Design a protein around this ligand. Structure first.
Ligand code: A1BJT
Ligand code: CL
Length: 167
């Protein structure tokens, strides 16, 4: 039993809700919140901009030190950093950005990072400003993630389309 509330169950292990991931993280304080990161951990907009803003820029400060030490992530890769006031940990996951020409096949590799964590609160990777089809992202999520994932979808219209079209 866990504290996630109001989710629709899609499969044995995937759940979905129309919710602002920032407000959801603040309420649940999950062990892991997933950020829709880029390789530079520059949290300017989309989900990343919103999560970082909610930490009062502490996520960005921590991220800049991480990059100075380790260099950029790989597309499809991830790193675990602090969850600040939102979660115990933040899993920064880089899905391919279609508006940069990145291989959509890398989306499966990106979701594989979720399997290293038993339970996660997450957005749909590569959706939003990353330019991928969210219906496809949900399909890859369901077919790749085996751990327990709670997906927060900000847009109500998109949420209804994802549920109604789910196979
Ligand atoms: C149609 O594209 C939206 C997608 O659902 C997407 N973004 C989000 N997902 C889940 N929680 C979220 N809280 C936010 C707060 C701000 Br401000 C901006 C974006 C998000 C956000 C890309 C995954
Ligand atoms: Cl977004």
């Amino acid at each position: 039993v866990n504290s996630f509330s109001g989710y629709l169950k899609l499969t044995d292990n995937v759940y979905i809700k129309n919710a602002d991931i920032v407000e959801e993280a603040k309420k649940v304080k999950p062990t892991v919140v997933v950020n829709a990161a880029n390789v530079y951990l520059k949290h300017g907009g989309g989900v990343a901009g919103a999560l970082n803003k909610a930490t009062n820029n502490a996520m960005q400060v921590e991220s800049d030190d991480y990059i100075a030490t380790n260099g950029p992530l790989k597309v499809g890769g991830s790193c675990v950093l602090s969850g600040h006031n939102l979660a115990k940990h933040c899993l920064h996951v880089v899905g391919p950005n279609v508006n940069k020409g990145e291989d959509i096949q890398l989306l499966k590799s990106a979701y594989e990072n979720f399997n290293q964590h038993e339970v996660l609160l997450a957005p749909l990777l590569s959706a939003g400003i990353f330019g991928a089809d969210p219906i496809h992202s949900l399909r890859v999520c369901v077919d790749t993630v085996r751990t327990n994932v709670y997906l927060a979808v900000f847009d109500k219209n998109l949420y209804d389309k994802l549920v109604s079209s789910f196979l």
